[PDB]
Design a protein around this ligand. Sequence first.
Ligand code: ZN
Length: 257
Amino acid sequence: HWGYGKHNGPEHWHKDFPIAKGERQSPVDIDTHTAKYDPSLKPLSVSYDQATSLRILNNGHAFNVEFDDSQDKAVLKGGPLDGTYRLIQFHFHWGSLDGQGSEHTVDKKKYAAELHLVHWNTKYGDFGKAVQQPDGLAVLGIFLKVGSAKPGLQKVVDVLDSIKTPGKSADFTNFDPRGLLPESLDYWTYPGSLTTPPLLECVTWIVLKEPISVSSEQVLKFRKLNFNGEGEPEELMVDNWRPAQPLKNRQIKASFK
Ligand SMILES: [Zn+2]
C-alpha cells in the first residue's frame, strides 16, 4: 500500500512501519557546518572490477540493477566498514523536475537524483539475513547533478522503456558500475536505515561529496516508468524520494575537511 503520493507517501509510512519515527532513520540533511571531520576514517575501497550484472527490474518504486552476489565480485571495503560488503543492486531516486530528486541533501541543497549502491555484509548469510543486523548493509550514495552526460549511464537509461510496467525486468548483463563513480571518494558517513519500507535500521551510509554529472537528456529518461498499477490512465514514477529525516542523537562524520 505504501508509495509516494499524498495518501500513502512518506508522511504515512509510520502507520505500517513505526520505525519510520525511530532513532536511526535515513535520509538526512548533511549540514557541512556540523558534520565532523574524523581523522580515523580510512579511505573507501570500491572494488568493482569483477562486477557481474544480471538484470534490471521495475519493482514499483524504483528500477534496480541486480548483481551476482553469490561470491565476492563487486565489493565495498574500508572506509567506516569492518569487513567486506557485496554489491547486490543499485537504484536511483529522482524528481518530477530537475530541482529535486535526491534523498540526502547538502546544506539543504537538493540534487536532481541520487544513486544508491546497496551492499550486504558477508559476515551474514545473505541480504535477507543482513537487513536484520545493525551493520548488515552499506549503501554508497552518489548525487546526480545535471550537466555533461555520464557515458557509463547510457546503457541504463537506454533500456528503461522495456520495463515501464511495474514488475517487469530485462536481461542486463555486462554492465560495469565503475562507470557511475566520480573521481573523488571523499565521503560523509553515519548510521541509518533503508529509505524505503521496511525502513530497517541496518545501514552504514557512505555519501560521496562529489556528484556525478548526468545530462538533462539522461535524467528525463528516468521519468518514463510507471508506479505500481497499470491503467487505464495510471501513474508515472517520479518524486520517489523520502525527504530528509531528523538526525536525532547521531553524528555525521566526514573523511575530509
Ligand atoms: Zn535508495
